[PDB]
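Dear all,

This email documents one entry for the complex benchmark we are building for the journal club exercise. For each entry we list the sequence lines for every component of the assembly. Then comes the predicted three-dimensional structure of the complex as a token string, followed by one or two observations. Please use this as the template for your own entries, and keep the labels exactly as they appear.
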Amino acid sequence: AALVVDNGSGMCKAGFAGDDAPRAVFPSIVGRPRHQGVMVKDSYVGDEAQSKRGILTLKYPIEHGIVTNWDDMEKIWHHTFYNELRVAPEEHPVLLTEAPLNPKANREKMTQIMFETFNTPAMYVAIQAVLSLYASGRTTGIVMDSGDGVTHTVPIYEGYALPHAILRLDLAGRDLTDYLMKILTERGYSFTTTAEREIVRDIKEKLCYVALDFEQEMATAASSSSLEKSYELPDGQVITIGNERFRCPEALFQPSFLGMESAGIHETTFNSIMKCDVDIRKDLYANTVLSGGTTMYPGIADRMQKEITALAPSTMKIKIIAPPERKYSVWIGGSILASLSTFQQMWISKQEYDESGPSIVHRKCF
Amino acid sequence: AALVVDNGSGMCKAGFAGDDAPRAVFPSIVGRPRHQGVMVKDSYVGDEAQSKRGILTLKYPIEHGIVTNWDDMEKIWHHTFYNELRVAPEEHPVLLTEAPLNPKANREKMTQIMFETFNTPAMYVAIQAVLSLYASGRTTGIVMDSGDGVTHTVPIYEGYALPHAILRLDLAGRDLTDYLMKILTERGYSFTTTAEREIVRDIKEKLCYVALDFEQEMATAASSSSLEKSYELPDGQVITIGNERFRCPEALFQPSFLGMESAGIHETTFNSIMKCDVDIRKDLYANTVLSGGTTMYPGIADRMQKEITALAPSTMKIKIIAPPERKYSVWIGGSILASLSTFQQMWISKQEYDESGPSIVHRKCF
Amino acid sequence: AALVVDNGSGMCKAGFAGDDAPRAVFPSIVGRPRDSYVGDEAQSKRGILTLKYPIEHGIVTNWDDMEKIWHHTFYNELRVAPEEHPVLLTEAPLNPKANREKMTQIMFETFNTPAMYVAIQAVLSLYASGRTTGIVMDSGDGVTHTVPIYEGYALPHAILRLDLAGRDLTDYLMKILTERGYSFTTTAEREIVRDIKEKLCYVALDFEQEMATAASSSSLEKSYELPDGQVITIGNERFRCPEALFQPSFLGMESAGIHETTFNSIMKCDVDIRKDLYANTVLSGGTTMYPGIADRMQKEITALAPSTMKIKIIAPPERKYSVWIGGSILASLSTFQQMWISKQEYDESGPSIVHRKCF
Amino acid sequence: KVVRQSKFRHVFGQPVKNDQCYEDIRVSRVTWDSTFCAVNPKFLAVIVEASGGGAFLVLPLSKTGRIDKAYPTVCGHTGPVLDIDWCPHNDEVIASGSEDCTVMVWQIPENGLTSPLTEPVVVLEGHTKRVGIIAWHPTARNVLLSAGCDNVVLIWNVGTAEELYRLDSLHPDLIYNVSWNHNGSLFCSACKDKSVRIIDPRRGTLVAEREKAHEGARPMRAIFLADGKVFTTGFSRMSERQLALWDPENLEEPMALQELDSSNGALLPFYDPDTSVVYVCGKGDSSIRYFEITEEPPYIHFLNTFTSKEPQRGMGSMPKRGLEVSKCEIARFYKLHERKCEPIVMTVPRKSDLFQDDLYPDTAGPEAALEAEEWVSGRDADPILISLREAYV
Ligand SMILES: Nc1ncnc2c1ncn2[C@@H]1O[C@H](COP(=O)(O)OP(=O)(O)O)[C@@H](O)[C@H]1O
Ligand SMILES: Nc1ncnc2c1ncn2[C@@H]1O[C@H](COP(=O)(O)OP(=O)(O)O)[C@@H](O)[C@H]1O
Ligand SMILES: Nc1ncnc2c1ncn2[C@@H]1O[C@H](COP(=O)(O)OP(=O)(O)O)[C@@H](O)[C@H]1O
Ligand SMILES: [Mg+2]
Ligand SMILES: [Mg+2]
Ligand SMILES: [Mg+2]
């Protein structure tokens, strides 16, 4: 039984190969107390830090897809194997996922930790974009992976990846959460501490949506109360939000709302296709696959369909593939790959690693 | 054998660690004769002053939790160890209790008196609100400690105290006793001397209660005599009181009766909860613990439940915990804590204090 | 003779254009019984009524009460008719566009003001310092803002807000004064504590060194006389109260101090303009009037900024009312007469005219 | 009687101000569980991450504040450095172990580095796998122990670059750490097979061994105390971190066995022979716990715990000679973050401002008692003691 672990910026999905959904999904946070104990555990990880967050300092070990603290990163992995999956890491091979264009220094640490700290028998690292294509049952298409830290567009054609056309956008769910906190203060609600960041993230995951026409939705919001929703805070207080429901997701298509000089996700996807050869752009237009939790907003597929169509030539057929389980597309693709009979030759044994080093994982990987 | 001493504004409780009730419970007064002796001891402390109070001037060494006279404070402690407990202070460790947000200057004097006047082998100072939580077997909840001098609301979550949310109310049993004396003169009974203050206090502890609806109760007392009760004075005279039974405790919820600007105990409890983090307000609503003798009025738990529910959101479950022995909750919690095997590391030796000073007691404490 | 009204979070500054100082400085509160008292009247009744802040955090939240304050300023404080003088209003940074239009609508329809102009408080502070590029640390009564300004335009994406200002320091001073036996709990005693804070508090260059000095001698003790003749003494509380600005953990706050907030806002700007903001840090607001706050902020930011960057903290002596004084100079200029939003223009473009005439 | 008699029951930690710290230090990203820091009364050595090969940053203690990104480093190894250790008898000599299968001994100039240091004094090549364990001999001069992943223990002679002893068939699995005893005659070692071994290097014999000392599969440590006992940190079957004390004359059962918590990360014990206080710092933990080892049961007394809000990547302990005696300081720890080295001051609260005779007994000096040639013959001696009263100001 092989383990498939997908480490993201905000969430960590874990499970067993062959299943249809991750068995363990918990936030990738480490919380530490910020008060003094008066009544006679110095850190909390995952859902335990989420239930005690009123007295904890929540810190994300991964920021923008960059591990800011490896000591806290090992806590997430240790919590995964022993507390969530409740399995011994030394008895099951582990399949890991990595972001596209992952630095080799980052990949070596992940390989080094798995083989020396957890002593896993076998290990393999796969591209998140490729795995998301496995879950959709395709060998050709461009995957717009938008998670919690960073957004990536990876065009894949007939099983061949094009690294030169991969574009990176430093804008994801965490930036949207911080923007929602900024615009909620305009309505009189102050969310400042890290514990209230998770509250706003819950608001964003429940009441935010992408408007087909942003300017038209603004006019309706200023002349009617049909788009207003109410949310209940943990203490029972009810807050009401109006145009903030579609203003926060609008930062994806208009990064200027955050003061960013880059283009929106629609143009990043379009620019990535244009960096490919002309003979393959037609297939990438009709096989645009969305992935990650930041693509779960209602109407984002329709808006992305509209925006790219205005950019692409009129003769091209634009098709946005948004499966309803795209939030776990990376993990589902990993479980499928780890169950294939042709994948057993891709395992890197622990015995091979200590006698060869990280040179064998740079090869046999992409 | 450890000693647990709970110095309150009006009443002093003492005993031994491991017991279930304080062995010595006597008022904290010092009485001095105000006449001249005609027949051939200049001060009386505790109960001996209460039996001779007809010729004495009774003074409380503590006023609003502030020591107004340290010379009289040493008399209370000397009476406790030698006359009440009948023990040698230089043989048993002493566990002391301090009010929340106790000034460091006041804590140093308690440290210096115990180690240089009584020469106790070990001493520890604990927060009264924390001890009251130990007796109820909880690590989470807001404690409203209403004694004789001052009322405190201290929220504690998972063993962590939040000092910034501690609210203080300068309204307690002594203010209610003085208010009862003021409103008893409206009925024709005049109590003015310090000896008659104790008589009115006994009336308050026996005939006063908290009305669920103050306005409805006043109408009932103005149209019926069912709420009238009789009390027998020490000289044999019988007095009858009507609406004064529930008007005196009503000052706790309406401090405007005393000309005060602050809000009632129900609003102080609610405001202290609102000062905490939003993620922990749910647990504080369901774990409101009442402590002190001023919370022993019949029907005060029902009134607090009704008042806080009107302030808190409808979705919050308000649960007021009022144990029947809450008059000794601070002492009972001290006896439990002093008997723990893990508490022996918190003792402060006399030898350590002589060589280090009061710097070590500010640490190791809260 | 134009009117300049600085809408502060806790204090409203009002006066006439061309004057060196505002004529009226009164608290911006509305009091209702526990039937409507505004300003010092709401504080004169003390405890019989409850106090509400409509602009509590620089952003207007209760427009019904905000109209009451403005009615109090024109008729009771300035003692003029608003329909005879142009009025220059000031707004906090990151003010929503809906609030700007509401202010325009109220001034032209409720007060029938002939001419109106709205300016940013942070921009006026920088201009009064003789600069067009810099970062203004506006620390007022209810809110603290660090507004980086480049070529006279504030960068909205880099403006940081801190809910730590003079109001929280006054409450903290009330809390730490009880450790000496004093008791200031009522509203009347709160104004006394604020008076103590404004006269005897100072920012220590080295807090830990200052605590040792205060605990080893009585040279830092100062005496203050209460309105009833009683005299109180304060020791280390003089520099402990303003220390909460740099160490918010003293108030149980997770947020960073004003020195880290200023540095964090600078790092949110373009890399090629950070060197100019480091050398043009201008303090503004009443809470920046503590002696020694410029030297402390200079020392703290230098520890955060790279050693090759030049840190210069600008503390003009008039920075307490720099927003209003900047408004009075600008509104009194003869050439400024053409940038007023006339009532005639309001009737044609509606409240939306403020977006194109005042940016 | 009510309170256990001790002098360090109230020791509290206090980090130094930001201007006394060391910022902008790219601390190493190696999974190896070492201290990552070595500090003497003169310099501060931190293992740093190099673009190619391996290097560690050596800077004078007075060089506080932000460190230049182009500051010269000791970059001579072709692989990342694993362990560093200052020579006890020479404040300017530091040995470094790396995964390039060699041990390099350096000579640091008195004022520090002006240019990057690439040439070492000695290149000691006797290991076939990576060397992650380095320990100088406490008494013998120029004697250095290096233990690599090839499960071999080697004794070097730094002055002559000779191989004094080779101990290859004594550890059947990977070695966690080694620690010399008081006089440097024996050394204890913790192995991956859950076994604690006490070894005499000169005779090449196993003096003692405890199989399954700690039942957990996670890494453990084993150190020698001044009285000759063995102090070990380890894990249980339920993955719960414990503490143990072992009597070398009776290894059947531990003298003490206390559990601390159920967190990950190896516990690195720092031992102070003068005060008999053991500081236990866990890699990735944000707290430092110190215990006092006495002859009264349970032989391991918990004193207190210094807590912070930042996990530590490494830790270095300043020897007694570099402490500020006049301020009642008994230990200084240079906590390593991922980009900063924050010294932490452990001080005994005392009212008197005079020199404390009881807190500061005679400590080992920077003068070697024996030499490599004499130690080989079989001579044994205690470290030369010096007085800290001269350092009082
Ligand atoms: N239904 C939803 N609507 C909007 N955003 C969502 C939804 N579900 C998850 N998210 C956002 O997706 C982000 C991370 O999702 P995921 O793709 O799992 O990231 P990662 O790849 O880092 O694990 C979260 O920060 C969350 O805000
Ligand atoms: N049964 C009761 N009903 C009403 N009030 C009471 C009762 N018992 C005690 N009190 C009041 O409680 C006050 C002090 O009680 P206690 O909590 O012991 O105060 P302290 O904490 O100062 O010792 C007394 O002044 C007394 O008036
Ligand atoms: N001389 C002074 N020293 C310290 N603080 C002051 C001084 N003068 C005023 N303050 C503080 O400044 C606060 C309000 O000043 P101001 O900047 O006008 O606030 P706002 O701009 O929000 O109206 C008051 O709460 C007061 O405590
Ligand atoms: Mg992802
Ligand atoms: Mg009490
Ligand atoms: Mg202002």
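Observations: The helical segments of chain D are 372-377. Chain D is about 0% helix and 45% strand.
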